[PDB]
Amino acid sequence: PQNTFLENIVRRSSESSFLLGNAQIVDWPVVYSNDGFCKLSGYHRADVMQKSSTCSFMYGELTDKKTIEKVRQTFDNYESNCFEVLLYKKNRTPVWFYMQIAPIRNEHEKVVLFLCTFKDITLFKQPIEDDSTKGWTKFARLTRALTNSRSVLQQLTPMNKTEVVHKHSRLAEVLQLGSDILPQYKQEAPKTPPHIILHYCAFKTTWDWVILILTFYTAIMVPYNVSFKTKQNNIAWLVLDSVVDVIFLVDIVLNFHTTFVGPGGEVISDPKLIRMNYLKTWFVIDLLSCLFSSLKVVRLLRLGRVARKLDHYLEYGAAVLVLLVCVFGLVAHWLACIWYSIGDYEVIDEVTNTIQIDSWLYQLALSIGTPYRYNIWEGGPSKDSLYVSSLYFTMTSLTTIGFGNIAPTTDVEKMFSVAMMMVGSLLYATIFGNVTTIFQQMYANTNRYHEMLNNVRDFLKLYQVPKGLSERVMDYIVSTWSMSKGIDTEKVLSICPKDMRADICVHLNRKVFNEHPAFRLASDGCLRALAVEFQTIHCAPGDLIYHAGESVDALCFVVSGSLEVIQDDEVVAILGKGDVFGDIFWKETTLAHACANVRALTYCDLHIIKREALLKVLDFYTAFANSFSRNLTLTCNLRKRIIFRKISDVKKEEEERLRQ
Amino acid sequence: PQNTFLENIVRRSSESSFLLGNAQIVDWPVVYSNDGFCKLSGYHRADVMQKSSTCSFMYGELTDKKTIEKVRQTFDNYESNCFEVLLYKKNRTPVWFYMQIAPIRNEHEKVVLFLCTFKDITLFKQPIEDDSTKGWTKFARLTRALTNSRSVLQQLTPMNKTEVVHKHSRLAEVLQLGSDILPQYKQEAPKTPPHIILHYCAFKTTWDWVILILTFYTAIMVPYNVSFKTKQNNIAWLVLDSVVDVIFLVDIVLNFHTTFVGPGGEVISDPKLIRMNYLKTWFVIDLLSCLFSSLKVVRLLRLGRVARKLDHYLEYGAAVLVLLVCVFGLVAHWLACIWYSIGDYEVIDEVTNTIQIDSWLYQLALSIGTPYRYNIWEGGPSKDSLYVSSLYFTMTSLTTIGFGNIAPTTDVEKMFSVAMMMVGSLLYATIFGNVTTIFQQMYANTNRYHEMLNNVRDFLKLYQVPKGLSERVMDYIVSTWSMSKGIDTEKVLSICPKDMRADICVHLNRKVFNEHPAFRLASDGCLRALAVEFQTIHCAPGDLIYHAGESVDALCFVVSGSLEVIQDDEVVAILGKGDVFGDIFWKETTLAHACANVRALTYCDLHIIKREALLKVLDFYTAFANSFSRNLTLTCNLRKRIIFRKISDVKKEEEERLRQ
Ligand SMILES: [K+]
């Protein structure tokens, strides 16, 4: 979905000086100045911007008061007009301009912008100039200002007193241009000319699959009809052929109304280019449809016509395996048809009207019971037994089995099998290369995990790591691969741009930015700065986050599980399910000593933000920092040491006092 | 092993205000306040914490002295009671609360915690209020305080003078709740409901393997009985079938008492979910057990029943190869049974009672001696020769050998072999993809080492490195791969969390932290900080650690071998087996010049800690640094240069003096 608005204006204006300006703002500041307005006015695109769209920066002591109010009036209430005025220039040269103010709406009509296409007219207006010494210089400036008016604009009828053909010609031009040049400032979609079908539509996919099915049917059925010569008695076998031919003719017709992707861009819906491409490329498919062995062998090119599109149906994976099976079947069928075609030409030699003994059909008849008999020679084996036996031989010859009960033996079967054994070998090699590559690609995901497990196990066994640590490490590896099965967050987030990465990071930490009072008065430009530095750890029971001597270096937000803050082998706090613990990193300026052991009691989920990153973010948005300091209350500050006395010490002191 | 204690309390309390507090500490500080206690008291979970668990932070001038002593009494000696008191609130609103103090023990009874579940009761107590202007406001507050009491708590019998049904109803409620809500504060284990069997237990694995063996037996034996039709004469072949059927029925019964792992978690021992899952999933296996070709072909689904669990038995490696062999055998057996089933229906045509000559059993009888004879047609070949010959043909057809002495030739054997040659090709392709992938994974470990050796050899040969250096480099590579065969410490330590990495690093350097006086008064939080930065080098004889001009930058502890400190080609120290050498990095603030060559005399083992890391650790724990400086004595300080004079110089000076 593109918002092309600056492309529709320029193409449909023929080198104008349009000066788009905002409408909702007071005084209507401009937002864009075309290059044409930068040469017909002398100003650059650094002084025009943020000035009024009424073109009030080139007023003066000679502009008429009868029209200076009218432009403001027509800007007040949203309507289009074609006033003309007298404006100055950067070099203080008076010149008459022809304004064409016209409103431009939103997707829902809200008049967002104000098109202000200009047009220089000086030859057609009365020459007036105050600061001049020679009167002919004004007439010279008349021609100097209008150079294109005598070349392409108004040279149709060059003759005097022709003022009306300049005013009344384009009074309501924008009204006539309401359909030509007044686009809609909306997020558009790929537009299609009339009677044009997109190639991403939900209709072309179904038609493509139907064409695939019908091409597979034709590939199966054409050689069988050509070689075995089934007599056309049933009506169905003819109406089906007629329907298929009509459908593929309709497909050829529809190929003239499809949009091919540009070589260096995206979809191009231009009929001329589409027709040129299809004329240049694919009459190989036009030959087959228009109208017997030769005709049907020509029709077989329809398989190539459906295979030219072998990217909308397929992928690289199991689909390639299915295609490899389907092409092996078709090759085994085509070779079975050619083998019977060869083996029927040699059975009966018409020169002597005698049967050839060293053929393959005669030996079939000699090893199946039914022989050939002479009336001409009458029938022999059936026709449902000459296809099974002809496919069986080619299956023995393509799978490299070769039982050898049906063998090539005359003169030509031996030199046809030499050609068959080459195509069979080539197909077998390609199949057994593709299968290996596909299987390696498929199982490359589950080999890294086992390799890592073996590496870790060998490491833990070589260095004689104790049983407890080895069990904990193996359990951690298995658990972390059981919920993150091959997915690495860093690799996926690295290939995304700076905008989508921040949004994904904000989405991941949605259980800390939503259910926490601290992250309430935070701008969208600050959440996308905090979320990038948030980490996450998946603790296990018994795991220690902070030991009794480590330095607290990061805030941690618990979103699942429970924690236990043990100090002097005494529980002083039980955090869990939305409790923040750590140190006040902003108002200390010093690292602290973790004065208690934080041990996990359940499989936890902590979101960690480091001290340096938190200070870097908080030292830049020095407005959210106040709210963060005034709204974040740590339930367990691991810098202040709590002082207490167990009851055992009290009892011992009481006993000591009782002693003396 | 999870320590779930905050989950058992909340579920079994029905939205209470439990206020767990410590017991061993004096005054019983609290350690956790439920959200309920944060709305029935107005306090947040930042002021309640570290206050007394007797709820002494909401006392006042109206609480009764007859019960304020009783709560302290029952807290002194560990016992449970259900006192009720009058307490204030954060907004100074008097309200009556119903305390339910109850002790909570450890794994070994030590009364760790004190559950202090509260309950608001105001409607049922005498309305008393001091700071009020209107008397009806107190009655309004009676209803305002108790909103859930008229909805779910005590709306069973709404009627007046019903005070007893509020007091005596739950006097000893915690005594009745001693089994409902009073968990044990211990590191628990996955608990199982009665009559529920875990799937990790040592019993389910043996039963699974038994099911695997019996399914393999059934897969072997069912087609043989169906096709070859062995007459059931022996008692064993029937009692074995009955026993197998009974065992698999018992397996179906036990499948109702197994725990399947949750889709987004771990084991779930809930009978309702287990039954719902098994009802939804697997009556395909219930059909086969309950009660002839069709029945046994249905029974063959038991193989799918045992293959659905193809992750508890298998792995990715040689086990896949064993499975591939075992499935090839079973396919060759099933095809051998189907081939004999086809080849027995065609031998004798019952329409004419004549033998078909172009079958495969008749040609077997014609090429094995024993023919078929007519009495009906009597027996021919034996029954132990019709299975060997039927498996031989399928082995020729699946291994793509095809001797062709037994061949498909009638009408149906040719169209059954066409279907056999497709499944054979598919199985062969999958097998030869899996074998290649498995072999690549297996031998990928020993290809990196040879590739590195070849790279190093080509590097040393291209640049014409001298013989000595090349030999030393190759020996070093071979030696370092002979004791670290593929294991990289950094990769294994990088995939571990911050807690296990420190423990592993401490374990690795156990020969320096134990047998050294310097690392004696070191806290557990300091050894885990030093051990991460310790390195290790495996020297070789003749290798120099510090040359005569290098800068000493790290402390080195020798744990194996011997070293030689040569200065001016004179030995001044022989370090070995627990001797530290280097420079005093803390009390110098300046880099030094190594004034002697430290050469290895034997295959050594040095543990190296750099200067910057050592200073960073020692500048943070400024209590261990004093002990480290007062307990570490270097036996060879490579900053102080020793001054001496060889005897040769003395002799030369004496000779010079004797000269004149
Ligand atoms: K062969």
Side-chain angles (χ1 to χ4, degrees):
Chain A
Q2 297 186 2
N3 197 349
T4 74
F5 168 59
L6 287 181
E7 272 77 62
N8 290 55
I9 297 296
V10 174
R11 302 191 298 80
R12 301 174 182 178
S13 85
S14 297
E15 280 90 6
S16 58
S17 306
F18 73 81
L19 164 64
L20 311 161
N22 217 336
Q24 321 275 285
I25 321 290
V26 298
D27 199 28
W28 310 284
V30 299
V31 294
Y32 190 68
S33 305
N34 188 248
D35 279 318
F37 191 77
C38 293
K39 63 165 53 151
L40 282 72
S41 66
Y43 286 92
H44 288 239
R45 198 163 44 196
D47 183 0
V48 183
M49 279 217 189
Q50 313 314 330
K51 303 293 189 292
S52 163
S53 177
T54 55
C55 184
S56 69
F57 47 92
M58 294 182 286
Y59 280 158
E61 55 270 38
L62 286 178
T63 186
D64 217 0
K65 306 325 182 63
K66 300 289 95 176
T67 63
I68 190 167
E69 293 294 327
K70 308 273 220 203
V71 292
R72 185 146 286 213
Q73 179 215 319
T74 189
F75 265 95
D76 291 331
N77 45 5
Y78 312 124
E79 52 206 350
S80 63
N81 199 313
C82 295
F83 293 101
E84 63 91 17
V85 286
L86 160 70
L87 310 162
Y88 283 141
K89 202 177 283 187
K90 200 159 191 32
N91 50 3
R92 278 78 53 85
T93 63
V95 64
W96 296 69
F97 282 165
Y98 184 50
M99 294 177 71
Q100 298 223 309
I101 303 105
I104 290 172
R105 303 288 176 91
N106 209 341
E107 49 191 3
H108 39 270
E109 271 58 34
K110 182 175 73 175
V111 64
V112 176
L113 301 173
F114 263 115
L115 185 66
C116 297
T117 61
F118 281 88
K119 184 161 310 293
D120 204 312
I121 74 164
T122 317
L123 279 171
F124 296 161
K125 299 289 94 175
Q126 168 67 227
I128 299 290
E129 164 75 74
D130 167 51
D131 288 331
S132 183
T133 303
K134 288 171 66 179
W136 192 88
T137 55
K138 186 167 62 156
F139 166 67
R141 294 207 289 105
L142 298 185
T143 65
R144 292 165 193 170
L146 278 194
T147 316
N148 51 1
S149 284
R150 271 200 299 239
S151 308
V152 293
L153 297 189
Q154 290 96 26
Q155 73 165 358
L156 276 76
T157 316
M159 61 79 71
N160 73 303
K161 60 169 44 66
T162 309
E163 188 67 28
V164 187
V165 186
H166 311 318
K167 191 167 250 203
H168 285 83
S169 71
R170 50 168 59 90
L171 289 174
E173 199 186 8
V174 291
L175 274 75
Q176 302 138 42
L177 292 166
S179 66
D180 206 37
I181 174 170
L182 293 175
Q184 191 169 1
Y185 195 60
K186 63 180 174 67
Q187 186 98 321
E188 293 165 20
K191 274 302 271 162
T192 66
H195 283 175
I196 288 291
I197 297 169
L198 289 173
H199 71 108
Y200 291 166
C201 66
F203 162 68
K204 276 287 295 179
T205 290
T206 290
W207 187 280
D208 279 342
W209 282 90
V210 165
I211 296 299
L212 168 72
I213 298 293
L214 298 186
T215 48
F216 182 76
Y217 162 81
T218 57
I220 280 176
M221 212 75 218
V222 160
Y224 190 97
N225 276 327
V226 174
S227 182
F228 286 80
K229 297 163 188 139
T230 58
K231 211 55 60 162
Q232 299 300 324
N233 298 116
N234 212 359
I235 312 283
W237 294 119
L238 262 185
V239 67
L240 277 179
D241 192 12
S242 181
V243 162
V244 166
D245 184 358
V246 160
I247 285 179
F248 280 102
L249 261 183
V250 171
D251 192 59
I252 297 169
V253 176
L254 265 69
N255 274 327
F256 273 126
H257 307 332
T258 187
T259 52
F260 68 101
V261 293
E266 288 184 354
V267 298
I268 63 188
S269 66
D270 183 80
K272 301 272 149 273
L273 268 72
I274 301 172
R275 288 178 186 172
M276 185 64 72
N277 195 8
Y278 182 76
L279 273 292
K280 174 172 271 283
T281 44
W282 280 118
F283 286 167
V284 188
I285 75 168
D286 188 81
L287 183 68
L288 61 84
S289 185
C290 66
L291 301 101
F292 193 71
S293 75
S294 162
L295 185 60
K296 272 59 152 162
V297 170
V298 163
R299 292 242 296 268
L300 273 186
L301 297 171
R302 177 183 316 185
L303 188 153
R305 177 171 62 190
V306 76
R308 75 185 177 180
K309 298 152 197 191
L310 203 65
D311 283 327
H312 303 57
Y313 318 111
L314 202 69
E315 201 73 23
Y316 206 75
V320 186
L321 297 184
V322 181
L323 162 77
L324 283 181
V325 174
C326 288
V327 69
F328 181 79
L330 290 178
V331 171
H333 177 47
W334 293 343
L335 300 170
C337 295
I338 305 164
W339 174 252
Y340 176 64
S341 297
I342 284 175
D344 199 14
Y345 176 73
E346 294 178 353
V347 171
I348 301 161
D349 188 356
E350 291 293 0
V351 180
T352 81
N353 213 7
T354 61
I355 312 193
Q356 279 209 31
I357 297 183
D358 54 353
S359 67
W360 84 269
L361 281 186
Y362 181 63
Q363 309 217 299
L364 185 155
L366 183 63
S367 73
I368 209 166
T370 58
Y372 277 99
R373 74 167 92 104
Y374 185 71
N375 199 1
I376 68 167
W377 292 96
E378 210 189 341
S382 175
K383 197 171 288 295
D384 57 356
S385 278
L386 293 186
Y387 182 73
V388 179
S389 171
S390 311
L391 171 70
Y392 155 73
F393 171 55
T394 62
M395 279 302 258
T396 55
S397 175
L398 292 175
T399 53
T400 62
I401 292 175
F403 287 117
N405 60 301
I406 285 156
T409 175
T410 318
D411 181 355
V412 180
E413 311 168 356
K414 284 182 178 177
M415 65 179 288
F416 164 60
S417 288
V418 170
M420 180 191 307
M421 293 180 183
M422 271 295 208
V423 304
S425 298
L426 292 172
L427 172 78
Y428 182 76
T430 68
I431 283 175
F432 271 33
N434 281 341
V435 171
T436 57
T437 60
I438 288 160
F439 269 49
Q440 184 178 2
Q441 173 214 330
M442 281 173 27
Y443 287 126
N445 193 5
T446 185
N447 280 320
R448 282 173 29 246
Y449 165 55
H450 285 113
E451 200 275 335
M452 180 193 48
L453 278 184
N454 292 325
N455 191 359
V456 171
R457 196 176 291 136
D458 296 353
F459 171 82
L460 299 172
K461 201 218 285 162
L462 161 71
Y463 286 89
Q464 316 174 278
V465 181
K467 214 163 60 63
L469 270 158
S470 179
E471 290 177 348
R472 292 180 48 225
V473 168
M474 292 295 307
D475 272 6
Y476 171 80
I477 297 291
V478 169
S479 163
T480 190
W481 200 277
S482 175
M483 62 195 47
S484 309
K485 54 212 81 173
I487 308 303
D488 176 73
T489 315
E490 281 325 319
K491 282 193 284 289
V492 181
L493 286 182
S494 295
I495 60 188
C496 303
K498 189 200 59 85
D499 166 52
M500 291 165 227
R501 192 199 330 257
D503 291 331
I504 290 173
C505 287
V506 166
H507 174 257
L508 294 183
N509 315 299
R510 64 181 185 286
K511 290 175 304 313
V512 178
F513 296 151
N514 283 298
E515 303 146 28
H516 212 286
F519 308 101
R520 197 51 71 74
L521 311 163
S523 45
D524 204 345
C526 185
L527 294 181
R528 297 166 41 125
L530 286 164
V532 193
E533 272 96 0
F534 266 86
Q535 281 144 62
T536 185
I537 62 170
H538 298 279
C539 306
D543 277 4
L544 273 78
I545 297 90
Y546 289 130
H547 182 74
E550 311 199 358
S551 48
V552 297
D553 209 356
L555 275 177
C556 314
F557 299 84
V558 186
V559 303
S560 173
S562 285
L563 297 175
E564 204 190 26
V565 178
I566 320 167
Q567 173 191 312
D568 297 330
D569 170 23
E570 296 286 346
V571 177
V572 309
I574 304 182
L575 322 170
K577 195 52 191 43
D579 273 298
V580 63
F581 68 96
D583 197 17
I584 297 169
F585 295 111
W586 40 99
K587 293 184 290 185
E588 289 292 8
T589 70
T590 54
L591 294 174
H593 272 194
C595 65
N597 300 334
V598 185
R599 208 172 37 81
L601 301 182
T602 302
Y603 283 86
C604 285
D605 276 315
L606 286 87
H607 281 163
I608 293 171
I609 175 165
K610 292 289 185 182
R611 166 202 215 265
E612 311 283 352
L614 179 57
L615 294 174
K616 193 155 46 57
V617 180
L618 281 195
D619 281 340
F620 183 64
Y621 306 83
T622 68
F624 173 62
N626 275 305
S627 183
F628 195 64
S629 294
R630 215 163 42 75
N631 278 285
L632 187 70
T633 64
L634 302 101
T635 49
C636 180
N637 177 317
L638 289 189
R639 181 206 272 282
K640 185 183 286 185
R641 178 175 171 84
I642 183 169
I643 61 170
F644 52 81
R645 288 200 40 230
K646 326 187 171 85
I647 53 150
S648 71
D649 295 3
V650 176
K651 294 303 112 175
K652 274 192 191 103
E653 195 82 31
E654 213 74 50
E655 289 319 292
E656 184 262 5
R657 189 48 52 170
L658 188 140
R659 182 149 38 77
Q660 76 267 14
Chain B
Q2 297 186 2
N3 197 349
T4 74
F5 168 59
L6 287 181
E7 272 77 62
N8 290 55
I9 297 296
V10 174
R11 302 191 298 80
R12 301 174 182 178
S13 85
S14 297
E15 280 90 6
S16 58
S17 306
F18 73 81
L19 164 64
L20 311 161
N22 217 336
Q24 321 275 285
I25 321 290
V26 298
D27 199 28
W28 310 284
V30 299
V31 294
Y32 190 68
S33 305
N34 188 248
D35 279 318
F37 191 77
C38 293
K39 63 165 53 151
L40 282 72
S41 66
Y43 286 92
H44 288 239
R45 198 163 44 196
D47 183 0
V48 183
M49 279 217 189
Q50 313 314 330
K51 303 293 189 292
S52 163
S53 177
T54 55
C55 184
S56 69
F57 47 92
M58 294 182 286
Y59 280 158
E61 55 270 38
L62 286 178
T63 186
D64 217 0
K65 306 325 182 63
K66 300 289 95 176
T67 63
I68 190 167
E69 293 294 327
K70 308 273 220 203
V71 292
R72 185 146 286 213
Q73 179 215 319
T74 189
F75 265 95
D76 291 331
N77 45 5
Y78 312 124
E79 52 206 350
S80 63
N81 199 313
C82 295
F83 293 101
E84 63 91 17
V85 286
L86 160 70
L87 310 162
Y88 283 141
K89 202 177 283 187
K90 200 159 191 32
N91 50 3
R92 278 78 53 85
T93 63
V95 64
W96 296 69
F97 282 165
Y98 184 50
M99 294 177 71
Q100 299 223 309
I101 303 105
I104 290 172
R105 303 288 176 91
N106 209 341
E107 49 191 3
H108 39 270
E109 271 58 34
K110 182 175 73 175
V111 64
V112 176
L113 301 173
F114 263 115
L115 185 66
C116 297
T117 61
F118 281 88
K119 184 161 310 293
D120 204 312
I121 74 164
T122 317
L123 279 171
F124 296 161
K125 299 289 94 175
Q126 168 67 227
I128 299 290
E129 164 75 74
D130 167 51
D131 288 331
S132 183
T133 303
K134 288 171 66 179
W136 192 88
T137 55
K138 186 167 62 156
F139 166 67
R141 294 207 289 105
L142 298 185
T143 65
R144 292 165 193 170
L146 278 194
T147 316
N148 51 1
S149 284
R150 271 200 299 239
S151 308
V152 293
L153 297 189
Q154 290 96 26
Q155 73 165 358
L156 276 76
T157 316
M159 61 79 71
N160 73 303
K161 60 169 44 66
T162 309
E163 188 67 28
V164 187
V165 186
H166 311 318
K167 191 167 250 203
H168 285 83
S169 71
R170 50 168 59 90
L171 289 174
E173 199 186 8
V174 291
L175 274 75
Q176 302 138 222
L177 292 166
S179 66
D180 206 37
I181 174 170
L182 293 175
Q184 191 169 1
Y185 195 60
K186 63 180 174 67
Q187 186 98 321
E188 293 165 20
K191 274 302 271 162
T192 66
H195 283 175
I196 288 291
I197 297 169
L198 289 173
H199 71 108
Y200 291 166
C201 66
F203 162 68
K204 276 287 295 179
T205 290
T206 290
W207 187 280
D208 279 342
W209 282 90
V210 165
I211 296 299
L212 168 72
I213 298 293
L214 298 186
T215 48
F216 182 76
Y217 162 81
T218 57
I220 280 176
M221 212 75 218
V222 160
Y224 189 97
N225 276 327
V226 174
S227 182
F228 286 80
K229 297 163 188 139
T230 58
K231 210 55 60 162
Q232 300 300 324
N233 298 116
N234 213 359
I235 312 283
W237 294 119
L238 262 185
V239 67
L240 277 179
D241 192 12
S242 181
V243 162
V244 166
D245 184 358
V246 160
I247 285 179
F248 280 102
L249 261 183
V250 171
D251 192 59
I252 297 169
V253 176
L254 265 69
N255 274 327
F256 273 126
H257 307 332
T258 187
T259 52
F260 68 101
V261 293
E266 288 184 354
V267 298
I268 63 188
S269 66
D270 183 80
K272 301 272 149 273
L273 268 72
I274 301 172
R275 288 178 186 172
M276 185 64 72
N277 195 8
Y278 182 76
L279 273 292
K280 174 172 271 283
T281 44
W282 280 118
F283 286 167
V284 188
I285 75 168
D286 188 81
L287 183 68
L288 61 84
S289 185
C290 66
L291 301 101
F292 193 71
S293 75
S294 162
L295 185 60
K296 272 59 152 162
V297 170
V298 163
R299 292 242 296 268
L300 273 186
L301 297 171
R302 177 183 316 185
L303 188 153
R305 177 171 62 190
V306 76
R308 75 185 177 180
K309 298 152 197 191
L310 203 65
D311 283 327
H312 303 57
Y313 318 111
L314 202 70
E315 201 73 23
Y316 206 75
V320 186
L321 297 184
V322 181
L323 162 77
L324 283 181
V325 174
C326 288
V327 69
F328 181 79
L330 290 178
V331 171
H333 177 47
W334 293 343
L335 300 170
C337 295
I338 305 164
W339 174 252
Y340 176 64
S341 297
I342 284 175
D344 199 14
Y345 176 73
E346 294 178 353
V347 171
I348 301 161
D349 188 356
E350 291 293 0
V351 180
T352 81
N353 213 7
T354 61
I355 312 193
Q356 279 209 31
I357 297 183
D358 54 353
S359 67
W360 84 269
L361 281 186
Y362 181 63
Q363 309 217 299
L364 185 155
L366 183 63
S367 73
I368 209 166
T370 58
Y372 277 99
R373 74 167 92 104
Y374 185 71
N375 199 1
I376 68 167
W377 292 96
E378 210 189 341
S382 175
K383 197 171 288 295
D384 57 356
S385 278
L386 293 186
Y387 181 73
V388 179
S389 171
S390 311
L391 171 70
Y392 155 73
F393 171 55
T394 62
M395 279 302 258
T396 55
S397 175
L398 292 176
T399 53
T400 62
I401 292 175
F403 287 117
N405 60 301
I406 285 156
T409 175
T410 318
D411 181 355
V412 180
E413 311 168 356
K414 284 182 178 177
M415 65 179 288
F416 164 60
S417 288
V418 170
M420 180 191 307
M421 293 180 183
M422 271 295 208
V423 304
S425 298
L426 292 172
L427 172 78
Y428 182 76
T430 68
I431 283 175
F432 271 33
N434 281 341
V435 171
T436 57
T437 60
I438 288 160
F439 269 49
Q440 203 144 340
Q441 173 214 330
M442 281 173 27
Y443 287 126
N445 193 5
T446 185
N447 280 320
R448 282 173 29 246
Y449 165 55
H450 285 113
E451 200 275 335
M452 180 193 48
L453 278 184
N454 292 325
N455 191 359
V456 171
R457 196 176 291 136
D458 296 353
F459 171 82
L460 299 172
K461 201 218 285 162
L462 161 71
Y463 286 89
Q464 316 174 278
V465 181
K467 214 163 60 63
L469 270 158
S470 179
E471 290 177 348
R472 292 180 48 225
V473 168
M474 292 295 307
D475 272 6
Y476 171 80
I477 297 291
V478 169
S479 163
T480 190
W481 200 277
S482 175
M483 62 195 47
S484 309
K485 54 212 81 173
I487 308 303
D488 176 73
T489 315
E490 281 325 319
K491 282 193 284 289
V492 181
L493 286 182
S494 295
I495 60 188
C496 303
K498 189 200 59 85
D499 166 52
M500 291 165 227
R501 192 199 330 257
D503 291 331
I504 290 173
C505 287
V506 166
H507 174 257
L508 294 183
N509 315 299
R510 64 181 185 286
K511 290 175 304 313
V512 178
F513 296 151
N514 283 298
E515 303 146 28
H516 212 286
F519 308 101
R520 197 51 71 74
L521 311 163
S523 45
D524 204 345
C526 185
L527 294 181
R528 297 166 41 125
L530 286 164
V532 193
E533 272 96 0
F534 266 86
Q535 281 144 62
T536 185
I537 62 170
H538 298 279
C539 306
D543 277 4
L544 273 78
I545 297 90
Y546 289 130
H547 182 74
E550 311 199 358
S551 48
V552 297
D553 209 356
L555 275 177
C556 314
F557 299 84
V558 186
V559 303
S560 173
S562 285
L563 297 175
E564 204 190 26
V565 178
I566 320 167
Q567 173 191 312
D568 297 330
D569 170 23
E570 296 286 346
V571 177
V572 309
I574 304 182
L575 322 170
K577 195 52 191 43
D579 273 298
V580 63
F581 68 96
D583 197 17
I584 297 169
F585 295 111
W586 40 99
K587 293 184 290 185
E588 289 292 8
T589 70
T590 54
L591 294 174
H593 272 194
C595 65
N597 300 334
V598 185
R599 208 172 37 81
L601 301 182
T602 302
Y603 283 86
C604 285
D605 276 315
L606 286 87
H607 281 163
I608 293 171
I609 175 165
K610 292 289 185 182
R611 166 202 215 265
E612 311 283 352
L614 179 57
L615 294 174
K616 193 155 46 57
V617 180
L618 281 195
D619 281 340
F620 183 64
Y621 306 83
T622 68
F624 173 62
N626 275 305
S627 183
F628 195 64
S629 294
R630 215 163 42 75
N631 278 285
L632 187 70
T633 64
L634 302 101
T635 49
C636 180
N637 177 317
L638 289 189
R639 181 206 272 282
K640 185 183 286 185
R641 178 175 171 84
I642 183 169
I643 61 170
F644 52 81
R645 288 200 40 230
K646 326 187 171 85
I647 53 150
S648 71
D649 295 3
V650 176
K651 294 303 112 175
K652 274 192 191 103
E653 195 82 31
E654 213 74 50
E655 289 319 292
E656 184 262 5
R657 189 48 52 170
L658 188 140
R659 182 149 38 77
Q660 76 267 14

